[PDB]
Design a protein around this nucleic acid. Structure first.
Lengths: 248, 104
RNA sequence: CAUCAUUCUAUGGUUACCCAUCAUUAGAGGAAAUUUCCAAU
RNA sequence: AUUGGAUAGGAACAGCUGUACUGGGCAGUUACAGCAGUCGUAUGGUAACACAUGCGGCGUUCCGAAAUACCAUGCCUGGC
RNA sequence: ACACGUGCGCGAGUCGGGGGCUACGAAAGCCGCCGUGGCGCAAUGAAGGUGAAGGCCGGCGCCGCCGGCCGAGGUGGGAUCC
RNA sequence: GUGCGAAUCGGUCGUCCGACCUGGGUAUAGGGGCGAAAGACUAAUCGAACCAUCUAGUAGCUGGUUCCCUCCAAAGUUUCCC
RNA sequence: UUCUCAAACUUUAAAUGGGUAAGAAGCCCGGCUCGCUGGUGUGGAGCCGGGCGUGGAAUGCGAGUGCCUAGUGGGCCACUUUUGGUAAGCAGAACUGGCGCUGCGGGAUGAACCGAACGCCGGGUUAAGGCGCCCGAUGCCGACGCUCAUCAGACCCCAGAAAA
RNA sequence: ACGCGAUGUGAUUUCUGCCCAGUGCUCUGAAUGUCAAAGUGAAGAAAUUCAAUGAAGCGCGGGUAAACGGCGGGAGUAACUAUGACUCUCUUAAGGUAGCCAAAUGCCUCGUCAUCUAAUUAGUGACGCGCAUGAAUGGAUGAACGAGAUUCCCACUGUCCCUA
RNA sequence: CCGCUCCGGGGACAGUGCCAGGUGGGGAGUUUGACUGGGGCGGUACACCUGUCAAACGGUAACGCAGGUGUCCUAAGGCGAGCUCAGGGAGGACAGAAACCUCCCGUGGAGCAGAAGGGCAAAAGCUCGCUUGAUCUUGAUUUUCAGUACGAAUACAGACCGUGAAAGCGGGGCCUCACGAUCCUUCUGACCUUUUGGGUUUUAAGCAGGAGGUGUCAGAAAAGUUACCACAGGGAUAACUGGCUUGUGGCGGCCAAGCGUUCAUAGCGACGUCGCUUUUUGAUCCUUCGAUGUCGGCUCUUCCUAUCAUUGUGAAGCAGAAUUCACCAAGCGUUGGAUUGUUCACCCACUAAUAGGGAACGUGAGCUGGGUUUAGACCGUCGUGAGACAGGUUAGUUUUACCCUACU
């Protein structure tokens, strides 16, 4: 009769993100005339650490083309980007690293990151630490581009949309084993209240559909229907197959 | 059991014994506009779930097989039901049992 | 003795209609391969 | 041609001894011969009845249609 | 609310209770062309409905209907009375 | 063990740079919260807080059911019944 | 022929038991009715009208009838019969009487055994039980026996013993 | 997507066997059974009735056990017996593999053998036809750690002899 | 410069509104019979029939005894006719114990669908002939019984019929069992009633008779679990003691087939048989459920004798020594330990001996808390699961006396 922890997660209140010291939103520069018809130049002010995120972010400072004000942006920093470097961005930008030009205007086999999925949404895909997307093929009829995503899914994309060249910085941090629960405590304390994961079998049968029993077992298949309601949808959600994942 | 498809029995309208035509009775299809079935659906519809009992404790395995007697004389053609006792197997003029015949 | 084809008749034959066939609905039934049979099927 | 019994037929075992299968032997199996053991039996002893002594015959448990690789031969060992 | 018993009034009726008229009195009294109405006086059928003694003597041994007169059973037991 | 105490006291213990301790502020509210999970905790209350009402909830089950005398005086059996 | 048996065997076959009858609604002639029954005013039934009171076994007793109706619907015990069970202060029946609802005399003491059922009293008399003393009553010159126990025996139910 | 969310297992080491029949989950609708409203079509004066049609799902067909889970019985057999490599049959979706064990899991049971003792239903080491062990329902191990559960030895001691 | 969407990506689809189907313990509500020598498990003694119990009317109980039932039958119903059966004896080619054929005996010893009982011989059986009284319809009655239903039955009456020459006989089965309310559905019946302002027509609703069924059979629509549990109660009812009882356990007699070289009885005693005891277990349900603290130990007193030792003795198959049997006998003893929570058992060692018992299975405001026996956890088996397990394992609050008595 008790609501399960996942249903409690949607309310927020406790399961909300820890965004006190999070250093702004890591957005790709807005589309304007000087992204669309040619390039605009900005300086890399400082690569900086963001709590909860693994990739370092780069304060890149452009100059406003209409005002005498100066515009600071927070890019997901490309691996090998440094401070006092010029970042260029636009249709007539050049194809070297940290340099965000539209995906249609770069060749096939081009490694990108912080890629826009729908044109002018300021960079959504392949912007976790170490991750990259490859431009596979173009289609000047329809103005569309197949791009392979970090998962392995080839997704068609509207050619006009932009991505910093190269892989994201902070790459390969999942290779190091967190030795100790405290290092895991410290990780998720910068993100949200999710960490010390109590398995449902150890819970009581009122809190979770797996709980109860004089042995610590499930007693129903862990694999469950996609249509299943909130509170029962637990275990392996709509599992196509299961067990030791052999072959490709 | 076994009942013949012909039966010289009483015809109510004719007021005499006349040869009838025996056939096994079946139910008709339930009319959707019978008062009970109309009352049922008005009650059953909406919220409240199942409103009247669903009988489940089915005890007996056979029926009282009923004959539909039909008067042969074509002015009358009047009918009535003729209920017989419970029986599992039942046939209309199958094969008359014989005597002095070998069970091989 | 049996069956068919023929005409002659008979107080006889329903003509908005008879019969052989075409069809579907209404019931009854086997020799043999397989042997060594039995009662089946 | 499904089938379903049967009963036609193959199988796994057989208490010890003795004799015969061999160039000669270790073992079997089989043929058999006598006791056991089964079976009947009449006395000897009963208050019980369960033995004893002697004589005369004597495998079982399975699997339908078989199905077994090769079958009772397997081995060792002597040929100047 | 109902049933039965009992007391009282009236009695094939009965009842104003609602309405109206004229200190105790918010009572009491009155109405009758205020009994509307209730319950009782009639039942029975699902319903359409129907809806609670007869005999004898004559005009035509028996007549459909003409009339005539007496006319709401019988047996048995029955307090009382004669 | 009618206590100092509706959980305390003594010795003895566990840990003491870290998933450490802690005050204030702040968020989550009752089939809800929160839970390193004991059905734990949510104001001495928790396998559904507390408050008022519905509510004088229902009870084939316990308990009680208030003066005197006089007369009559039982049944625990039948049949049917979740 | 002989031995022995039967709740679910039986030729016989009790005791106790269960019906019914023991008059006037009866008996008795006579006539009427009928569509029933018919060889037949046959058979049967039903009606009227007469005449027959020694009231037809004993004993006791006034009866008949209708409404409304509470409580109860856990029972238990005993003689005899009786089922299951080794038995049980066990479980279950039959009949009647008890207890429950009930005091009272006796059984020392007991729900039920025995006697007897109850207004408040005086005298008398008993029942069942008693009568050394407790404790009313044998304190009779009671009758005849029987019995010695180093475990005497001593009064329905009933409260402790067998084979030997 | 080196992200978020949902689960199981629980460091390291060394491993993680067989089963997709069942129950789920999942993929496929182009040979297509079942299938609702609406729509369509016909019959009827109409209400209505009938027929064709017909989504998902279910059925049919794949996949999947680090999904839930599961992982046999009976005979004969070696040249003393005992064991039975081997054979025969029954039989499943697959018949429990590598390990481990009278374990915190073994009913019988205080198993049998060894060891520890003067004596041990305790302990450890072995043995496994294991009532009912077993591989992420994780198996086997395991240094370091532990207010965890045991057993023994030394030392110590009023726990005791036996009390003051 | 000119403009009509701010640019871009979708787009008659998303999606939303409303219906429809499927999925839906994620939530909700509710259920989860009864009887019962406690409950459960099992059975059905829950509806019904036979013989018995049952005590010679009828009636009569138990989870009493022995059984049967949820059907079966177009004949196995209905007449009529003719036959005689089971079994036996004696014969007869093949032919034998058993085929068929005759004659004789044949009281029913067969058969009548089934359980059992009753009934039955020119039949109620057997074989044939024709048939549909197993039909239509009012009442009355019997059985159970409340003298209500149902089922089943009995006598009539009115029809229409069958059979037989006819008398008759027949409205199911030779009799005793084989079954079902309201509501709803369905069928059948009549130139039926009503479908509400009238009329016609479908339709619907009525009236009357069958059917679809409630087997918990006078008739709810229904799965578990709780060791996290709660409440009303119950000694109407289990888990202690105590009662009754003593099957079982223990202990003891009787008789004497045998044992004992001989020899029933030194010591034994089979086949039988009579008891006692309440330190065994049962049996029962009487007391206690507004609570009698529910294992063992420890401690401590008293008691019993069915005597192990010690005192006195009797008998031996008693030479001595050691040991057995029995008697008066409970005065006085009956130990230290290993393992086990254990009572029990077992072993070591000492010992005159290492007897057995009672006192609410003595003794928790005396302790202890090892075991069972709450809530935490692990395992195995079981269950889809929650969970279960006189199956192991580990951790788990032991309250009060100052009253009365008793004792000091």
């Amino acid at each position: 009769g008790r609501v399960i922890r996942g249903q409690r997660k949607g309310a927020g209140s406790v399961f909300r993100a820890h965004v006190k010291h999070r250093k702004g939103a890591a957005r790709l520069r807005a589309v304007d005339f000087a992204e669309r018809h040619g390039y605009i130049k900005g300086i890399v002010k400082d690569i900086i650490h963001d709590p909860g995120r693994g990739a370092p972010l780069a304060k890149v400072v452009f100059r406003d083309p209409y005002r005498f004000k100066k515009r600071t942006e927070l890019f997901i920093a490309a691996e090998g980007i440094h401070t006092g470097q010029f970042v260029y961005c636009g249709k007539k930008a050049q194809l070297n690293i940290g340099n965000v030009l539209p995906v249609g205007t770069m060749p096939e086999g081009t490694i990108v990151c912080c890629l826009e999925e729908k044109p002018g949404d300021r960079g959504k895909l392949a912007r976790a630490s170490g991750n990259y997307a490859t431009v596979i093929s173009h289609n000047p009829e329809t103005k569309k581009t197949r791009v392979k995503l970090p998962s392995g899914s080839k997704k068609v994309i509207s050619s006009a949309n932009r991505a910093v060249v190269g892989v994201v910085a902070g790459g390969g941090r999942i290779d190091k084993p967190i030795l100790k629960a405290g290092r895991a405590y410290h990780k998720y304390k910068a993100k949200r209240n999710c960490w010390p994961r109590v398995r449902g079998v150890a819970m009581n049968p009122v809190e979770h559909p797996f709980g109860g029993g004089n042995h610590q077992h499930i007693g129903k298949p862990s694999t469950i229907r996609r249509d299943a309601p909130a509170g029962r949808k637990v275990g392996l959600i709509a599992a196509r197959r299961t067990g030791r994942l052999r072959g490709t | 059991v076994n009942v013949p498809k012909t039966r010289r029995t009483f015809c109510k309208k004719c007021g005499k014994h006349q040869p009838h035509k025996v056939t096994q009775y079946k139910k008709g299809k339930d009319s959707l506009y019978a008062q009970g079935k109309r009352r049922y659906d008005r009650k059953q519809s909406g919220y409240g779930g199942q409103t009247k009992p669903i009988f489940r404790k089915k005890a007996k395995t056979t029926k009282k097989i009923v004959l539909r007697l039909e008067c042969v004389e074509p002015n009358c053609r009047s009918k009535r039901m003729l209920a017989i006792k419970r029986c599992k197997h039942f046939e209309l003029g199958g094969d008359k049992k014989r005597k002095g015949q070998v069970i091989q």
